[model samples]
Target: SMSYTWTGALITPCAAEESKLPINALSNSLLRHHNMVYATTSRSAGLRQKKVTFDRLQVLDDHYRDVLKEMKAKASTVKAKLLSVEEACKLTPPHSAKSKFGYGAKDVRNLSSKAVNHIHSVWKDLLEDTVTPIDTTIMAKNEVFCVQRKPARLIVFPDLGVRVCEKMALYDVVSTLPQVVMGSSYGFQYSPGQRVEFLVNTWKSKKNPMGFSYDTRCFDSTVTENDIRVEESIYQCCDLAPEARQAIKSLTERLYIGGPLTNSKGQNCGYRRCRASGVLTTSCGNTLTCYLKASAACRAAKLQDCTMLVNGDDLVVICESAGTQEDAASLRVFTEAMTRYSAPPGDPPQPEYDLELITSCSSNVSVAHDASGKRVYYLTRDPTTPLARAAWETARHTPVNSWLGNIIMYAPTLWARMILMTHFFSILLAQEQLEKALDCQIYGACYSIEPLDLPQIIERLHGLSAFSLHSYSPGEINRVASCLRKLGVPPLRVWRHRARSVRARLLSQGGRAATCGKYLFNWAVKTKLKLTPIPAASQLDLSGWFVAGYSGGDIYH
Candidate 1:
């Protein structure tokens, strides 16, 4: 089946869209070359459609089947529960798209009779009918970035009522199944600190480790009907409630496998045979499929003692290396095996002898010195995108503040500490919004976090060492410097000076702002405060921060 069948209907936008970065007072403070930054709009969605629409051919071999059987065996140990209407309603994001039937996310969250009653009816209808193709909205996402001029990412999601029902059927299964089945290889189950630990331990365990990240070019489109059905079969292995089983079956047939795509004006846009990115099962399904394909591909390529770290389509495999020539040839075979399974690489896989060089989830392991002059491992990435988006966010008020998420996830990195924290904290201090909560997405789930609470969040997520990390590796420094140069962001020296200013301003405020200054910007000053564990860090409830990947799952926490 074709991935998509279009009707020449335009992917219309609901309102005006901005394609260029809007400059403000703070923009030049972070980045000077404003022309380098841009945002994607519906105008370029046509290109995205062309790239994503294609015929997918999958051929499962003995290795694939063996891996599938193994996955099922593990999955069978799991037992899942169906979410009640109240539970499902509570899971809905407050700003989620409203249903055409009149009730909104607020109504659902508040458990209004109309919303609850309609949710019950939707669940009942799902149980009764298993074959009617569900309707989904296909919209081009407006995302900020550097000058890649990339097309808008398309988001496919069903109605709000059906979304709630999806939670009722599959929420527990999606949340618990991946960690159970994939085990230590499930990347989403790890915090940044834990992830670095896993990578370091895995690297040390391997004798001459050679690793590479597999880029599944358009992972969602590569998913076939067979793939969706196979994922459903894996879920069915779980001991589930009878009603949950029926709803899952119906959702698989109606919504998961394929659906009709409608534009913003409610006109028919096309039909999608690929995985809907915004569905409840999207994260789990992609993780399962990517793991299945890579596990079989590893076997097919005869890679020894392969250890995989999978977060949705982001895959990294660390395995015992043969000779350099043999390792190179094995990666070729691995790419071929993955291509045969219908998940071809965008950039062909290359084996790396150095674990620090192999990027996974857009991050690489790097070393730095803590306040006590002890070596510490942390995750860092090229700051071009993060810095570019930060420049954009400085000028525009947008949902999902990437800068805050960067500070949390990459808090220990030099660029994140010296640049991201300094830049954003200065902005917040100037606006007198230190206590205001901002939203950011970490591992695709939305989180509402306040700037005042970052000291504890960082302390909990990373450690007290995150507050005073210094003496970064040359490679990491060069990468950050090169990215700053490429994006026309101000040099690190300028940021250090700015950080001193921001730190002084924050310290003047006292209380939480003073704590932020004392913790997050201590490195900027000549005489730094002796960093210690935050008292509030122990009491913070950060349970679901690193449980699973929720990219395109319409999740909020």
Candidate 2:
């Protein structure tokens, strides 16, 4: 481990006449001056670093802002073009075919009215379909962006529009500000001119032998504290110390070296082959020993390239050289054995313990009744019984049980059954709400059904059950009828198809009304339908209704 020493200087109070300084004026003056100096230095440094970091952040902000401006311009252009199309469509008038039809042949006139009505309806549909107001707003909202602060350079996301203010790099400000403000003033503020001068000299005269040195045995090298202190003391105490001279002489001793003195396995020293001699001998033999030892230590401890080592190589060599090889080997073995068995040194030693909860379910088959009196099959991890205690325990710890409260909380139906198996009740519920709001089953059983006359469908089905018709809207039904007509269904056939389709759609929409109550409310407003509340707890009457001439089961009900 490396150690740090802190040296501080004491301050003395200055005496002055009572006339020159008020009573207890020295203490008050010193405190005031100290505070003023601290405030000035702190503020000055803060401003300098703030400016630098802010400049960098501003560059990032400007880059994002420019990109946002371009996106907004494009969105505005698209919006303008859409508005023009809408305006042109609005200027066109309704067809003249309705005016020519009369009332004597009333049914015939009504048939002609239907044809003319369809033409006008198609035109209106085209006009309303061009631009979705909600979609356009969302697109416009996503045009600009904001960049949030992170460890690296800030990142900008164009869709989430946000303006960056005078942002600054936290680290840059922290590192540079104090230095810029207090570099010249730190010591002066604490100590007077003479003391400050003395401190400066002491710092300048101080020898930092902990500075970089080289090692050969290992890839990188370092100097140890003892080596530095010994070198310094040798030079300081005597013009030439004998031990220092002896250390230089023994540079070619081919000293057996390994990791730190504490890590050596005396019987199996890997790197302790032989010390270098001859021309390989570098200047200052003891220094070479120090270097080789450092290299070994660095490679062992993985600290050379980064920083210093824990124990000095010179101390190890000195102790070993002074003793018998057996004694040295014994010391090495003792330390190594002790270290291998010892717990590491640190505060609040950590404990070693492990705990886990395991679960299993029953395999036995049994039927039970839910709160709604519906038959439900139960499977347990423990197979002996339907109501196994272990099975119940497993269920309690299951993720679904935690998420949904209880399994009984869910409906006993194919949709709910699929949801449980797929573990996607949340997704299914969201899709259900979306399908209800759109008045169209985009997913699930009714997914294949198409819309007819959307506006007319909304108007006709406003008070009807969703399951009463297969079509989501009149437009969808009309489209289906047009297809049927192309496939040779007569006008009368198409009309019958429309009526039956409407009934099916109503029933489908209404049978699930209990589950889709909130959805229906929102749908009514969205489609501009009359706010007709779905009848509470109304079941679909599925008699005589068929898709492809086969009555679909009461799945929705």
Candidate 3:
């Protein structure tokens, strides 16, 4: 009988019964069947890496450098406000777990409730008792899959009240500052189109640019308690408020550093010996230190005009290549430099002559034809998650389907437009939820987005370039094919014939449906319709979604 905390000394639920609960059946099934990629190479890993010539280059002057400068400046100018307790509370989704202190997530969100009082207590405890690590709940998150079945990914997050404080203190800074300091190196800072552009341009800049991706084995686990404090030093550099600064230090000592980990079984799993994966500070902490370490390693290795692109722990380096022997020597030195700094390469750092061959964030530049039949090169990823999420949509409801987010970011890609956009929107239309709005996360925070607005979103995000471009690497084609087969998804060519048909039928229904036709399905049509502008897309820029080199006004109907 939970009743507004009921005073009565707020008894905590005994964990014995809860600990006896069985694991989710869906997770068990997926675990039995799905592919599990790992931090280190097991039997399922690869051998024999290749070497290539990094000759030819681009001398970047005004074209790319100016754009980068402007982007960083814009990010620096963004001012973020801490969410009010009420606002922070509202962000907690209804189904979120209850607090241990006799309150559900709903109770915490209501400002007048005892949950808010408990939040204050947690905050005060963080400040007063800074030496003790906060405990985190660990569980399996159901994810979209590429195999014959679905699966779950493990996530570790702090208590509910603690999450609200995280939002209040660091969400804005993490959301804004990384873009300013890291510049274009930040992932989620650009769309697939922009990412590929950076890739091509970076490769071209060096006379002999050698590009390579370095991944840390079990990157989060590798982050020591000392790494967390080093990350805090980066944050301390910023001009934060006194309270905010105190809160930051407090959280760092108690929570952000290695914490106690409790698994789903409610047993004490052990203390976190490394960086926790699902917390608010994880991305920001990893980014700050990763960049610092990699940046220093690059200098020590004497990489020619070192350029780095880092997303969390995944790193891509593109710089002028030395002679064959010098190049090998440079890589060895770079590896050593990184290892000394606690960032040893996971797969032994394979270098490539072609930047397009380097994959990061599970995407690569690939080729497809626009409606004009011109071959196009845009960012594409295996539809593993989209297909995985699609299977789940048939069962319980999901916030916003993974396919929609994929369609927006990879809007210009062959697979995104043809397979993901078509499949998800058709399903939405059939369910009569065409104009319905739902929440989806972009750049780590949630936003209320709608299916009807994707056209404007794509147009703004990708621009007319979504319909034009060419020159994809052949290696990418094989990966796309391989992904298609594994996920049991249809081919790119299978989607080509369906575009014009979908476009025609979509616009005939009029209203927002017609607009979606132009924006999202425009390239799918024989002749594209001009998309009318949408203000909703213009307003919601919490993480600066419109940072790419595109104007919003010029997209299709």
Q: Pick the candidate with the highest lDDT.
A: 1
Worst 10 residues of 2 by lDDT: 158-167
What does candidate 2's lDDT look like per residue over 418-446, in tens digits?
22212222222324532322111110011
Q: Each model's TM-score, in the order given?
A: 0.98, 0.13, 0.77
- Model 1 clash pairs are none
Tens digits of lDDT, candidate 3, 119-146: 8877777667768778876554434444
lDDT of 1 by residue, 1-557 (tens): 79999999999898999888899888888888888888899999999999999998888899999999999999999999989999988878788899888899999999999998888899999989999998999999988888857899999999899999998888889999999999999999999899999999999999788899999899999999999999999999999999999999999999999989999999999899998999989999999999999999999999999999999989999999998899989999999999989999999888888889999999999898987789999888988889888988998888789999999898888988899999889888877999999999988888989989999999888878888888999898898888888878888899899999999999898999989989999999898778878787788789988888888777778
Q: What order do candidates take by TM-score, descending?
A: 1, 3, 2
Q: How close is candidate 3 to the true structure, as a TM-score?
A: 0.77
Assess the local accuracy of residue 351 in candidate 2 as a C-alpha lDDT between 0 and 100. 16
Better of 2 and 3 by lDDT: 3
Q: Which stretches of candidate 2 lie over 4 Å from their true place?
A: 1-415, 418-425, 428-535, 539-557
Q: Is candidate 1 or candidate 2 better by lDDT?
A: 1
lDDT value for model 3: 0.61
1 against 3, candidate with superior lDDT? 1
Evaluate residue 470 in candidate 1 and report its C-alpha lDDT on the 0 to 100 scale.
85
